[model samples]
Every structure is written in C-alpha cells, then in structure tokens.
Target: GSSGSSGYKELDVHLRRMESGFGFRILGGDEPGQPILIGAVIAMGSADRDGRLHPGDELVYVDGIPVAGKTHRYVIDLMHHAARNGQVNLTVRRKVLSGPSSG
Candidate 1:
C-alpha cells in the first residue's frame, strides 16, 4: 500500500486556525501562472507549531476541495471558511529526495 515511485510525498496536515491567522501564507493559484505553493510559516504560530507544513510545499487540496486552478483569493477564502468551522485538512505534495543505492 505504500510506494515511493512518485518521487513526491503526500502529506496531511490538520491545523486549527487561530484568531490571528493560520500562521502561514500561500502563493500561486492566482494568475494561472504558478502552482499553489506554501509561501511562509511563521515562527511560534499555528502552522509553525503544527510542524507539518513547510515553505515551497505545493498544495493539492483543502478540506477535500481541489485548488488546482482556483484563484488565490478564492482558495484563501475557502481555507478560512473551513478553518472557522473546525480544523482544516490540507493535502500537500512535497518533493522528496531519494537515497542513493539503498534499495
């Protein structure tokens, strides 16, 4: 059931959105130019505390909604809405570097 042939790992991050913010920023999904990617994770914030999200990670889904071609604004709103209800579920694709001659 587990495979590493994809070369990218799928991560699930569940985070609680605080009154201040999610403690992370996202870029892309705006002008249809760049893929939606994690921008920054603030230190000591919700995202930082979660320890799962990282900058440069590409977002695949948010609370089960695909954000592939959506605008940045729309995606942001969706995240906020989902967060307000409860913990937000994030699926991100992180590029993984495989080891050398180990297998």
Candidate 2:
C-alpha cells in the first residue's frame, strides 16, 4: 500500500539475534562493469528461517532504507553492516499472480 502513484506490496522479514551473515547471499555485481542483486535470496540461511523470504524474492529495503539505484557492493555492505545487531528489518518484492489480472 502506498500514498503515491506506486502500488506495490512489501514482503516483511527480520534477522533478529543473528549477529552475522543475515542468513542469505546477495550473489551479484561480482561479474562485469555494472552491479545488481541479480540472485535474490537463496541458500536458506538466516532469511530462510524467518519464513518470509524465498529464492526468487527481491529484497528492496533495509531497515526502512530503500536499496534502489544503490550499487550492489553498497547494498552488500549495508547488509553486512546491519548484521552487527542482528535485529535488522527487511522488505522484499516477490512477483506473483493474484488470481487473474482483468484486462
């Protein structure tokens, strides 16, 4: 739900008391000239236990901070940095078919 023109849903997840890793991998930006989140969440680590993330879900927010337009390395650093408290909040975006779209 949004107050602006954007009508997107948020996937909520948390990594409480993790104190490390955040139980997931960024898996991207390690390739060519540019960077991206590319792989989403996988490996079933910390985020898996939370039960709100999946292998295809896209993480777009970190502790209320938007990750859009941010460098892949920057986002990875953000995740790692947040792991210090292990009480970080995350929001993801997952593409799904809600019944059928009315064209």
> In terms of TM-score, how similar is model 1 to the real structure?
0.77
Q: Which regions of candidate 1 deviate over 4 angstroms?
A: 1-5, 18-21, 99-103
**Residue-wise C-alpha lDDT for candidate 1, range 55-78, written one tens digit per residue:** 878998888888887778877888
Model 1, C-alpha of 1: deviation from truth (Å): 14
- Per-residue lDDT, model 2, residue 13, is 78
RMSD of 1: 4.1
* lDDT per residue as tens, model 2, 18-99: 4335666665544433334436554556666667766645667776677766656767677667766557777777555467
What are the TM-scores, per candidate, against the unseen true structure?
Answer: 0.77, 0.64
Regions more than 4 Å wrong, model 2 = 1-7, 29-44, 99-103
Q: For model 2, what is the alpha-carbon lDDT of residue 30? A: 46
Clashing pairs in 2: 23-46
Worst 10 residues of 1 by lDDT: 1-10
lDDT of 1 at 79: 75
| lDDT (Cα) of model 2 | 0.63
